[PDB]
A paper describes a structure:
O-antigen acetylation by AT3 domain-containing acetyltransferases of Salmonella spp. can generate a specific immune response upon infection and can influence bacteriophage interactions. This study integrates in situ and in vitro functional analyses of two of these proteins, OafA and OafB (formerly F2GtrC), which display an “AT3-SGNH fused” domain architecture, where an integral membrane AT3 domain is fused to an extracytoplasmic SGNH domain. Multiple Salmonella serovars have a rhamnose moiety in the O-antigen that can be acetylated at the 2- and 3-hydroxyl groups by F2GtrC proteins. In AT3-SGNH proteins, the AT3 domain passes an acetyl group from an unidentified donor in the cytoplasm to the periplasmic face of the inner membrane. This acetyl group is then transferred to the SGNH domain, which catalyzes specific carbohydrate O-acetylation.
Numbering used by the authors: 380 to 640
Amino acid sequence: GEYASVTDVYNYYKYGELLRGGICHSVQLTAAISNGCIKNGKHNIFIIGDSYAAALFNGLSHYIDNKGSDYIISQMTDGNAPPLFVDGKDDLQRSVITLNNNRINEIKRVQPEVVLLTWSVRGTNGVHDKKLAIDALSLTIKKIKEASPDSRIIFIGPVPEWNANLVKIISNYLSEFKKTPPLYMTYGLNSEISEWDSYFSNNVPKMGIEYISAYKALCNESGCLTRVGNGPDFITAVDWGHLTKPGSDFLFNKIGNKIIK
């Protein structure tokens, strides 16, 4: 039905608009500053990382607007550029190390109240060995603390991932069983992400920063959240894992009060 008709997920979900592509996501530094992506006011929440970090913007914006909060949002994100100093290239063939040097320099300039970070743990320029990944994050943490000693640093952990595009997993369930799946499910759910979330829950707080489990916010004993309504416009992920607007909104409804007291 409606789920089977979504065959081009990036066009259907307006994926560029979702991440603020061409404005704050995957842009040159002079464009980022001119477009107002780096705020200098009080109560500034400064997002850094790859497209998983960009996907947080919608839910945080919605939480602030719904609460009538005076908090503001900065964003320096780029596809295939985690907030880790790894010698790889982003989607525009730029140096991931150069991009992270520029992010640290802007954090130093504006002294934000909060730095909010995440990445795609299985992505091209991620770090696959969990212990070496903690060591790489420790280098970023030390640079942020030196640049802006009063900033709170918050790592929002990995979101749930699926074995194909989530809309295709739901279409597959309907074709096999001719029944709508449950709201929370393990059908088509990737088993590795829970292991990353558990490792970070145990080890990140000892590094002198805050950890928020996105996985525990979106998952329960029945599995992980597929949707907040009937049809493709209400599912939680664009592809295997990048949050839709409804997915991002649900996450921040759950975790926003851990960021804004």
